[PDB]
């Protein structure tokens, strides 16, 4: 699959991805990813965005999920789910996710990746989640709800 | 003195170039790990990248 | 003694200068309170009309 | 609606709404919220707009009211019945509305809230209130007609 499984003493800490040319995966989870063709490729780290970034190999290449900035609120779609984008924030209902849903994938109805989350709260009848988006000007920034944790 | 004057002189250059270098890649990070932002021409000439 | 004190005889330019800074400190300090006060005023009546 | 009857002796003096995370009282209308959830919080007062804030707890900051600065003129849903915008004011059929009907929140047809009324004044067969609007801007402001009182 397009998302791959980061494996720590067998149990899956969190899923890292492979996002527009650059695997990530973010720096929290401790993991060899469980895809030989990936699993040493050397990673750039940055904790200014709590990840780690590499270019996939040149064959690789060609199964790489688009992203774009450009993301109206309204439903965007999640392996757990939903998640709804009102308010300049990105909402899932309660109880869904956690330790183990670190950096998976949040994509449009196209298909596209807008964001890749690293941790959440729940307040109330949903869930609001820190994530990593693709500003206005398609500039990367870490937005993150106050008191929320690294999933 | 000069081998306090060496010394004060290249630990300075060193820490400050070091933070030189540290901000010149915290400034590319978000463009580099966002393969389409249309390049900036007074970041992208200060710091270097080879432009769109 | 061949001459009189006035009172002021003895401030010199130091203690002057020290107590115009002083003044003029909480002169400054007082007027910049008040017209901050008025500026938020007017723009609190600008937001509404 | 989630507003909640203030009262003291046990009788209700006026409601209290929660919109954006944050119980907006009216400041003049007294006594004891009837959650004690939301007894404990140390409401923030500010007399400009008549009304005392307080940031609602964690657990409920996703199941509270929305708002809006966009507001057409037009008809407008309230708790009492529907509220007509015309010429930047609010108002009711005449004689609905008094002592109590403090602070309810004023909702578009969409569910928002776009204003939360603190009195009104009659005119002819209706009555003007006055209330707190997000004005084109969205800067809080509270608009009263002409020698409106306290309810």
Same sequence: chains 1, 4.
Avoid at chain 1, 78 to 97: D, L, S
Avoid at chain 2, 2 to 14: D, F, G, K, P, R
């Amino acid at each position: 699959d397009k998302t791959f499984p980061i494996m720590l003493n067998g149990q899956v800490n969190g899923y890292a991805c492979v996002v527009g040319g650059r695997v990530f995966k973010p720096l929290h989870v401790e993991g060899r990813i469980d895809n030989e063709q990936l699993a040493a490729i050397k990673l750039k780290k940055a904790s200014i965005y709590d990840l780690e970034y590499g270019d996939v190999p040149q064959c690789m290449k060609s199964d790489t999920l688009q992203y774009t900035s450009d993301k109206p609120p309204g439903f965007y779609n999640w392996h757990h789910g939903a998640v709804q984008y009102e308010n300049n924030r990105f909402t899932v209902p309660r109880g869904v996710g956690g330790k183990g849903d670190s950096g998976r994938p949040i994509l449009d109805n196209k298909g596209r990746v807008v964001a890749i989350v690293l941790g959440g709260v729940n307040e109330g009848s949903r869930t609001a989640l820190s994530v990593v988006t693709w500003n206005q000007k398609g500039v990367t920034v870490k937005d993150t709800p106050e008191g929320s944790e690294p999933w | 003195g000069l081998c306090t004057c060496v010394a004060i002189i290249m630990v300075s250059c060193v820490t400050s170039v070091w933070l030189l270098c540290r901000t010149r890649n915290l400034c590319i990070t978000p463009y580099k790990l966002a393969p389409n932002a249309q390049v900036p021409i007074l970041l992208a000439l200060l710091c270097c990248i080879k432009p769109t | 003694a061949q001459h009189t004190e006035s009172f002021t005889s003895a401030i010199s330019a130091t203690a002057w200068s020290w107590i115009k800074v002083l003044v003029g400190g909480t002169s400054a300090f007082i007027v910049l309170g008040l017209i901050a006060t008025a500026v938020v005023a007017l723009v609190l009546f600008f937001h509404r009309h």
